[PDB]
Design a protein around this motif. Structure first.
Motif, PDB file in Angstrom:
ATOM      1  N   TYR A   5       0.856  -1.184   0.000  1.00 52.67           N
ATOM      2  CA  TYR A   5       0.000   0.000   0.000  1.00 52.67           C
ATOM      3  C   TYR A   5       0.893   1.234   0.000  1.00 52.67           C
ATOM      4  CZ  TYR A   5      -3.650  -3.365   1.247  1.00 52.67           C
ATOM      5  OH  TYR A   5      -4.519  -4.448   1.293  1.00 52.67           O
ATOM      6  N   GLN A   6       1.046   1.833  -1.182  1.00 56.98           N
ATOM      7  CA  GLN A   6       1.964   2.973  -1.287  1.00 56.98           C
ATOM      8  C   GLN A   6       1.550   4.217  -0.486  1.00 56.98           C
ATOM      9  OE1 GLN A   6       4.893   2.600  -2.455  1.00 56.98           O
ATOM     10  NE2 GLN A   6       4.663   0.652  -3.559  1.00 56.98           N
ATOM     11  N   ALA A   7       2.500   4.788   0.262  1.00 60.93           N
ATOM     12  CA  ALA A   7       2.214   5.997   1.043  1.00 60.93           C
ATOM     13  C   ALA A   7       1.667   7.129   0.177  1.00 60.93           C
ATOM     14  CB  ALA A   7       3.474   6.459   1.876  1.00 60.93           C
ATOM     15  N   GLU A   8       2.205   7.252  -1.034  1.00 62.81           N
ATOM     16  CA  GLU A   8       1.868   8.386  -1.937  1.00 62.81           C
ATOM     17  C   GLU A   8       0.445   8.238  -2.502  1.00 62.81           C
ATOM     18  OE1 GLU A   8       4.633   6.332  -2.206  1.00 62.81           O
ATOM     19  OE2 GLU A   8       4.528   5.349  -4.215  1.00 62.81           O
ATOM     20  N   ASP A   9      -0.140   7.050  -2.322  1.00 62.67           N
ATOM     21  CA  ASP A   9      -1.514   6.748  -2.740  1.00 62.67           C
ATOM     22  C   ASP A   9      -2.520   6.869  -1.585  1.00 62.67           C
ATOM     23  OD1 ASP A   9      -0.698   6.155  -5.340  1.00 62.67           O
ATOM     24  OD2 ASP A   9      -0.396   4.026  -4.865  1.00 62.67           O
ATOM     25  N   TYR A  24      12.888   4.442  -3.292  1.00 65.45           N
ATOM     26  CA  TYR A  24      11.441   4.234  -3.034  1.00 65.45           C
ATOM     27  C   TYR A  24      10.833   3.197  -4.032  1.00 65.45           C
ATOM     28  CZ  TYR A  24      11.246   7.573  -6.861  1.00 65.45           C
ATOM     29  OH  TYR A  24      11.410   8.179  -8.108  1.00 65.45           O
ATOM     30  N   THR A  25       9.673   2.656  -3.687  1.00 67.43           N
ATOM     31  CA  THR A  25       8.894   1.781  -4.603  1.00 67.43           C
ATOM     32  C   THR A  25       7.603   2.534  -4.975  1.00 67.43           C
ATOM     33  OG1 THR A  25       7.825   0.545  -2.793  1.00 67.43           O
ATOM     34  CG2 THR A  25       9.994  -0.260  -3.640  1.00 67.43           C
ATOM     35  N   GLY A  26       6.862   2.057  -5.985  1.00 67.38           N
ATOM     36  CA  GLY A  26       5.750   2.887  -6.487  1.00 67.38           C
ATOM     37  C   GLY A  26       6.304   4.142  -7.144  1.00 67.38           C
ATOM     38  N   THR A  27       5.515   5.207  -7.183  1.00 64.54           N
ATOM     39  CA  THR A  27       5.941   6.402  -7.921  1.00 64.54           C
ATOM     40  C   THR A  27       6.713   7.427  -7.029  1.00 64.54           C
ATOM     41  OG1 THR A  27       3.722   7.251  -7.606  1.00 64.54           O
ATOM     42  CG2 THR A  27       4.178   6.231  -9.731  1.00 64.54           C
ATOM     43  N   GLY A  28       6.776   7.190  -5.724  1.00 67.29           N
ATOM     44  CA  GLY A  28       7.496   8.104  -4.844  1.00 67.29           C
ATOM     45  C   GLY A  28       7.373   7.658  -3.401  1.00 67.29           C
ATOM     46  N   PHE A  29       7.307   8.647  -2.508  1.00 67.31           N
ATOM     47  CA  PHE A  29       7.173   8.438  -1.051  1.00 67.31           C
ATOM     48  C   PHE A  29       6.544   9.671  -0.419  1.00 67.31           C
ATOM     49  CE2 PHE A  29      11.413  10.042  -1.942  1.00 67.31           C
ATOM     50  CZ  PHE A  29      11.574  11.120  -1.044  1.00 67.31           C
ATOM     51  N   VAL A  30       6.220   9.569   0.867  1.00 65.19           N
ATOM     52  CA  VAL A  30       5.665  10.713   1.564  1.00 65.19           C
ATOM     53  C   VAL A  30       6.710  11.292   2.508  1.00 65.19           C
ATOM     54  CG1 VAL A  30       3.925  11.554   3.199  1.00 65.19           C
ATOM     55  CG2 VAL A  30       3.305   9.950   1.331  1.00 65.19           C
ATOM     56  N   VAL A 121       8.179   7.955   4.561  1.00 67.04           N
ATOM     57  CA  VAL A 121       7.527   6.633   4.473  1.00 67.04           C
ATOM     58  C   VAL A 121       7.236   6.278   3.010  1.00 67.04           C
ATOM     59  CG1 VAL A 121       5.544   5.146   5.118  1.00 67.04           C
ATOM     60  CG2 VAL A 121       6.538   6.798   6.808  1.00 67.04           C
ATOM     61  N   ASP A 122       7.726   5.114   2.586  1.00 66.89           N
ATOM     62  CA  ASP A 122       7.573   4.673   1.223  1.00 66.89           C
ATOM     63  C   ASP A 122       6.208   4.002   1.009  1.00 66.89           C
ATOM     64  OD1 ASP A 122       8.173   3.748  -1.393  1.00 66.89           O
ATOM     65  OD2 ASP A 122       9.010   1.873  -0.628  1.00 66.89           O
ATOM     66  N   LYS A 123       5.836   3.133   1.955  1.00 64.78           N
ATOM     67  CA  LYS A 123       4.644   2.291   1.852  1.00 64.78           C
ATOM     68  C   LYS A 123       4.515   1.503   3.161  1.00 64.78           C
ATOM     69  CE  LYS A 123       7.344  -1.447  -0.254  1.00 64.78           C
ATOM     70  NZ  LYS A 123       7.582  -2.241  -1.546  1.00 64.78           N
TER      71      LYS A 123
HETATM   72 CA   LIG Z   1       6.204   4.525  -2.411  1.00 64.79          CA
END
Ligand SMILES: [Ca+2]
Ligand SMILES: O=C(O)C1=C[C@H](O)[C@@H](O)[C@@H](O[C@@H]2[C@H](O)[C@@H](O)[C@H](O)O[C@@H]2C(=O)O)O1
Ligand SMILES: [Ca+2]
Length: 126
Positions: A5-9, A24-30, A121-123
């Motif tokens: 569960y991506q943080a950026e989502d 990071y994984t997904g498109t970024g991080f928070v 936080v990445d996810k």
């Molecule tokens: Ca991420």
């Protein structure tokens, strides 16, 4: 199987989606704002009621631990979970937090309790 569960989502309060550190994984991080009360809240779905190992992937490029409180809406799940240094911002690691969930949809919120805000936080994965 565990799901990322991506943080950026997720629902971000006093924070920014960023992507200027590698790894990071997904498109970024928070990046939590450096303030107490900054938060991210993920919406997750799990198959059965019980206590899950919530894997929090994070970075903290400082020598000061940045604690978070976890809740599942309204109810405290974990209190003062410290997120210590990783030396540099691109040096992600994980910490497992026990969170009790109902079958189906749940919301997990991680809120910063000190004026430094949270770690990056990445996810979460569970
Ligand atoms: Ca991420
Ligand atoms: O939480 C931090 O202290 C932090 C997050 C960033 O990933 C780091 O690069 C660094 O960033 C500083 C501020 O927090 C950020 O909001 C600003 O845009 O840039 C700052 C910086 O040092 O580049 O620290
Ligand atoms: Ca920050």
């Amino acid at each position: 199987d565990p799901v990322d569960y991506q943080a950026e989502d997720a629902t971000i309060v006093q924070g920014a989606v960023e992507s200027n550190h590698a790894g990071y994984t997904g498109t970024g991080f928070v990046n939590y704002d450096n303030v107490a009360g900054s938060s991210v809240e993920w919406t997750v779905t799990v198959p059965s009621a019980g206590t899950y190992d919530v894997v929090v992937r994070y970075a903290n490029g400082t020598t000061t631990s940045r604690p978070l409180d976890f809740s599942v809406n309204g109810s405290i799940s974990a209190s003062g979970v410290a997120f210590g240094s990783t030396g540099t911002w691109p040096a992600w690691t994980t910490k497992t937090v026990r969170v009790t969930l109902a079958a189906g949809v749940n919301k997990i919120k991680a809120v910063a309790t000190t004026a430094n805000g949270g770690p990056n936080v990445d996810k979460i994965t569970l």
